[PDB]
Amino acid sequence: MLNSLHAITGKFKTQSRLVVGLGDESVYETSIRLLRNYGVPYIPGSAIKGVTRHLTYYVLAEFINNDFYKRAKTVQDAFMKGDPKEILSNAKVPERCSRLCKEFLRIFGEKKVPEIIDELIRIFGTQKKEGEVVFFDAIPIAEEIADKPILELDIMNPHYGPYYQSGEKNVPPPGDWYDPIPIFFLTVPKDVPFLVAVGGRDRELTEKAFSLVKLALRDLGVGAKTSLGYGRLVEYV
């Protein structure tokens, strides 16, 4: 059949090293990774969706007006937990835009604010609505891997917290810490090729989604330690 979905794809290489946590691998996941991809894990589409979500809450925080971190938390909670349409009703395009904001507005052309909220509702979904775009897993392109990638194995623990916080902070913040669960992480070298894709019935909606994903992989990153610059991917040939 094929899904009858429009699949927008591109080829991406790791611009900086990519740090990926190994979960509980199914036999399938282990099969592909060991036998096809020289041990290189994939990037879950849910992670691609998350970072792309995050990008849009960050930009849209510039569209309402207190402290920035509070606004971002508002936009994020609205899209993910509540009704974004209702809460961001009075959003207006800002006087001064960030670069990410500029890039965002280039994707969504001459569409007005309450309209773009709708396209984003459709792309990602909400608590009441199904998302109309599939965020596929980003997968190593085995044949285009020149030499056998040298992989590093390290152990780290997770610490969870709100991304947006008052004042400067360090992490984990005082009184808080990592959880007592050791996790394997593989570090993937630069210039490892991944296939990246999104799908949906609406071709133009799906294309916009792809553009956001591009934007998010170049400037925000996936995997762990992204704040140190790890996990950036850029399109090639």
Curated annotation (Swiss-Prot):
One BP term from GO: defense response to virus
Summarizing the function annotation, the protein's role is: CRISPR (clustered regularly interspaced short palindromic repeat), is an adaptive immune system that provides protection against mobile genetic elements (viruses, transposable elements and conjugative plasmids). CRISPR clusters contain sequences complementary to antecedent mobile elements and target invading nucleic acids. CRISPR clusters are transcribed and processed into CRISPR RNA (crRNA), formerly called psiRNA (prokaryotic silencing) in this organism.
Which top-rank group of organisms is this from? Archaea
Q: What is this protein's gene name?
A: cmr6
**Parent sequence residues shown:** 102 to 340 of 340
What protein family does this chain belong to? Belongs to the CRISPR system Cmr6 family.
MF-aspect GO terms: RNA binding
Its Gene Ontology cellular component terms are:
cytoplasm
Q: How does it assemble?
A: Part of the type III-B Cmr ribonucleoprotein (RNP) complex, an elongated RNP with Cmr2 and Cmr3 as the base, with Cmr4 and Cmr5 forming a helical core along the mature crRNA (39 or 45 nt in length), while the complex is capped by Cmr6 and Cmr1. The 5' end of the crRNA is bound to Cmr2 and Cmr3, while Cmr6 and a Cmr1 subunit (Cmr1-1 or Cmr1-2) cap the 3' end of the crRNA.
Q: Is Cytoplasm set as a keyword in this record? A: yes
Q: From which residue to which does any coiled coil extend?
A: none
Q: Which residues form the signal peptide?
A: none
The name under which this protein is listed is CRISPR system Cmr subunit Cmr6
Protein location: Cytoplasm
Main localization is: cytoplasm
Q: Which UniProt keywords apply?
A: Antiviral defense, Cytoplasm, RNA-binding
